[PDB]
Design a protein around this ligand. Sequence first.
Ligand SMILES: Cc1cc2nc3c(=O)[nH]c(=O)nc-3n(C[C@H](O)[C@H](O)[C@H](O)CO)c2cc1C
Ligand SMILES: [Zn+2]
Ligand SMILES: [Zn+2]
Lengths: 175, 175
Amino acid sequence: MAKKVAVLAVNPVNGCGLFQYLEAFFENGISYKVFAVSDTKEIKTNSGMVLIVDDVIANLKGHEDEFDALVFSCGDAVPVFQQYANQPYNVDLMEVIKTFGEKGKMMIGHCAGAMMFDFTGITKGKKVAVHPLAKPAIQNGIATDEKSEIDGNFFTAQDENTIWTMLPKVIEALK
Amino acid sequence: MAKKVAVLAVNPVNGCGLFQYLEAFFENGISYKVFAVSDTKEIKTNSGMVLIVDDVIANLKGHEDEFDALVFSCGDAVPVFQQYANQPYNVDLMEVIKTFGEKGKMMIGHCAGAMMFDFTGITKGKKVAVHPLAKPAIQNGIATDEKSEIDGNFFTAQDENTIWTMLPKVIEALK
Ligand SMILES: Cc1cc2nc3c(=O)[nH]c(=O)nc-3n(C[C@H](O)[C@H](O)[C@H](O)CO)c2cc1C
Ligand SMILES: [Zn+2]
Ligand SMILES: [Zn+2]
């Protein structure tokens, strides 16, 4: 019955968005493990702070059944995602997202998180919140202009500044 | 003429509160440096994340005139402050807050940040916003129950959840 959350942090990752999830989980006693979307668990933030997380994204593949939810913390790695699309960690990212979406896991994200989910196709026929610049990239999903969208098991926010509009409902759904 | 900000992060520090400042500073081209209120450059967050900042608080002394603002990021280190009040890094904390207060630098903080400010007497006759649990610990200052208090050069918030009520003003003050 005990839930488990897999948190995905890109490199670099928006620290404000990330530690809104993590500090909320810790204070509510929600278990979580943070995975780096890179070849090392030592990442940076957009602000420049060096951050050493729990593990890498490669060690998440095959362990999707051990978690009940997935969190995509957006960052400045996304505006250059297309350049590094063929990077090992960026390939593992789409695979992890795809598997979690098929298991029916709780999909959580913000900013460009909806687009990364939509690149797979798990957001088909689902209301999602996404950054105004990543909105025309939403093909399978149904992008809205709302600060946050909760449809089925998809919990998305427009950016890191509108996470507060959905975070309590995310918390009460986990523990 | 370039406004430089000195950010003080405790150990452990509330990650959500800290990166609300740093990411906001980054997106607005505000120069800042993060000093660890601990023995070493490497600290952790309340969530458990290993965080490596810029420098230690000891290397801030004598260089307070090289900054225009002082930020106090509260954390779980404060409820254990009375036990470690005689620690070298906690002694340096009170001495750098004093120095920044003498030159009339922009004093920023949240949660129990106003309490640490009031422990020096810099907040005399000044309205401050502080955590409800730390409110009776305000003798020199004028503690309120408001989310944020801006009085003169003091910019305090009730906790990490009410930083957004004063942060736009902080950014404008730092350009
Ligand atoms: C932790 C956190 C809590 C917030 N809470 C609120 C809130 O209660 N009401 C609100 O209108 N905006 C809230 N915001 C967003 C905030 O109003 C906005 O991002 C800017 O401060 C003003 O545009 C919050 C943002 C963060 C990061
Ligand atoms: Zn983003
Ligand atoms: Zn605190």
